[PDB]
Amino acid sequence: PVMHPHGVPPSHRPWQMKDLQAIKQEVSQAAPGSPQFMQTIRLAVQQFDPTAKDLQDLLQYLCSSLVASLHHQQLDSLISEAETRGITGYNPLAGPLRVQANNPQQQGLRREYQQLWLTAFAALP
């Protein structure tokens, strides 16, 4: 999660097991892929403002290894397509998008990464 304390720069903090349990319960209160599901996962992403690594770690906790890998596969294709067209605040010279999305200061890029990560569920059966 990325914290936004008043005044000081934003900072990253690891998931707490209670955070992940809370998200798991909220998500499990809706059928996977359903409109209420996608709404719940999006609201959880808003709550914790996670980095790219945070999002990967969350799915690793929520889903089976192969299903989380399927998401990663779908997201990688979305990222490639997004990189071809250009992404807000992304210069390939500063490193891979997934790595840049882990810099707490790059909010605009993190938020766009979050939207791509959310979009990649559109395939998850």
TrEMBL record:
Forms the spherical core of the virus that encapsulates the genomic RNA-nucleocapsid complex. It is found in: Virion. This is Gag. Homodimer; further assembles as homohexamers. Homodimer; the homodimers are part of the immature particles. Interacts with human TSG101 and NEDD4; these interactions are essential for budding and release of viral particles.
